[PDB]
Symmetry: C2
Subunit: 366 residues, 2 copies
């Protein structure tokens, strides 16, 4: 065979979201209505204070009032419903992912058929053939496109997905990689419980979306390289696997959102980056970071002493779409170039269970 | 751009492992209807008895024991939620079994777990974050900055898919050493017998547990012994066949479908597949060596007839189906390991596996000295 010569670069970015948009102001009433609990005035009150301090202005949801009425089991906090959840996802994800993918392909400039590798990641699924497969007919990808399917990788999925693309693009001349991350929060949706804070954090922080990226090295003259992926690394924060967990259950996609999370990223981020990239302050770089929440973003700002405008793009995404798991960071990178229209080097990173920090040192181009 | 490897990624070591509880095919019929309280269904047991006798498997290894089944009455109740208990058991057993296999592989390789740069793990028996890959970190003494890839639920073609990924990880970075691990615990499918559908009996007389690990890396040290260089890794789909085979998690267990059309769809299309996949790079298939996922004996026949292979070509593969049964994504790796032992001539060979899609994931290999 033959290989590529230069660095894998991001050639295009495409995103998409469910049509149903719920503002943050209206999330409490909506939520407490479809979950039949408007009587729990106090809990609904703790949920109002919470929401106002999350950093989100609005979210997009595939699930609606009609869909939830069609499935009272999603609300019955203690009833099996994964099947119903997976059947809706089995169709909705490929749909949403294709849309975001077409958008990326449109900016890129070449036909879906020119894609040689497909890397898909999402927590909203569990099928074989998976989304990666169903995207072939939906996009018009060649049958021999080389696929990787990543089911359930959590909040650091996008970055993790982009790490494999780099090597996929760099080790084969002409190789072109479509990376797709998509998330559907109906996987976690359930009624509230007087003592379960995680259900409210989720309900007021997560949102639906899919993000797409075309990666390739030795870009044509027709292609417009936006970012070069200099290095792609990952590391773990010591003894913190009990702060973030996710797992499929009979009832839904469950887990744990420890209060220590923000403090852990805050105390370890700088160290994590230096171990990952070691080889002139952090403000000399540009940033595209998975916005866990505003607190999390405040922890990163503090630890790195970044000027407000550095994570502006990232907070903007959290604010306009909410937390969309792995796709969030790619939305972030997108928002970063929209407004760019100065530093040449930057960091694209995301945290998730582990705790795991996945990142890439990027190089901006014309 | 940083330094890349010079030559092709190569298999420097292979290690396998299986749960301690071995069950022979002759024992399967009694074991199964007993623990499923269906021992009164004398007619159905006879059906499952002859089906079992022509699968091409003489014995298997199962993590689930009768004591474990008695402790989980919910497992044999086809109409009862239990994915929770199945996953809980797997969250502990898979990484423990996967460690055993990776350790044997690291032992063969000769180098320290600390020299491992990337970790790629695949398995249908898991659904957690941190997943099996993270857990192998403390269990194997791997460096924290090791670059992980967790592939949840990829089916019977996972072994090859995982290895296809490793080729690029290893080749793109000078000094890269990839640890690939595939593991399968069939308790994820375990349930009682059924009149309406015999997918259960099929799975019950064919699948077994196992885990396999491989160290992949290019530019071998003088202390390393490259076994097979991964020349090319590709993947393709067979038309209008996604209906004959599929899997998905359900509240009751890991379910799916096994169609009768599966074996015929492979015999009718393998050659087209290999051609489209490796076309240019490659007077008959009987000149290559073969490591093939062994769905069943019938599937082995189909490949033999379609490619025109003599009985010896797929012996290593049939040998694995016989000694272990179908262990999903890990099977094709046991086969390569078996081939390696049944060779202690063709320099080029094909490592191939099939799965839902239908998908054909294979690599063109080069046997070294």
């Amino acid at each position: 065979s033959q290989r590529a010569d230069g660095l894998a670069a991001v050639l295009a970015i495409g995103t998409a979201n469910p049509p149903n948009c719920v503002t943050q102001e209206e999330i409490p009433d909506f939520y407490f209505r479809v979950t039949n609990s408007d009587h729990l005035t106090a809990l609904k009150d703790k949920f109002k204070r919470i929401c106002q301090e999350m950093g989100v202005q609005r979210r997009y949801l595939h699930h609606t009032e009609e869909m939830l009425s069609a499935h009272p089991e999603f609300v019955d906090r203690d009833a099996p419903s994964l099947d119903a959840r997976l059947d809706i996802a089995a169709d909705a994800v490929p749909e949403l992912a294709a849309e975001a993918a077409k958008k990326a392909i449109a900016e890129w400039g070449r036909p879906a058929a020119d894609i040689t590798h497909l890397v898909v990641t999402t927590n909203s699924g569990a099928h074989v053939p998976g989304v990666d497969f169903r995207l072939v007919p939906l996009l018009g990808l060649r049958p021999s496109v080389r696929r990787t399917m990543l089911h359930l990788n959590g909040c650091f999925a996008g970055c993790a997905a982009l790490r494999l693309a780099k090597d996929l693009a760099e080790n084969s001349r002409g190789a072109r990689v479509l990376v797709v991350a998509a998330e559907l929060t109906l996987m976690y949706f359930t009624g509230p419980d007087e003592g379960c804070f995680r259900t409210l954090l989720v309900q007021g922080l997560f949102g639906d979306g899919a993000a797409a990226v075309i990666v390739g090295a030795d870009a044509d003259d027709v292609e417009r390289p936006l970012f070069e992926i200099v290095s792609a690394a990952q590391t773990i924060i010591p003894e913190s696997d009990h702060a973030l967990n996710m797992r499929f259950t009979e009832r839904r996609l469950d887990g744990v959102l420890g209060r220590q999370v923000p403090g852990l990223i805050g105390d370890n981020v700088e160290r994590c980056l230096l171990d990952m990239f070691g080889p002139g302050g952090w403000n000399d770089l540009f940033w595209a970071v998975h916005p866990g929440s505003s607190t999390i973003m405040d922890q990163v700002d503090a630890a790195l002493g970044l000027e407000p405008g550095k994570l502006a793009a990232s907070r903007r995404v959290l604010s306009d779409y909410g937390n969309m798991s792995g796709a969030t960071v790619i939305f972030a990178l997108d928002e970063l170039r929209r407004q760019r229209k100065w530093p040449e080097l930057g960091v694209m990173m995301a945290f998730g269970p582990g705790m795991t920090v996945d990142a890439m040192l990027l190089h901006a181009t014309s």
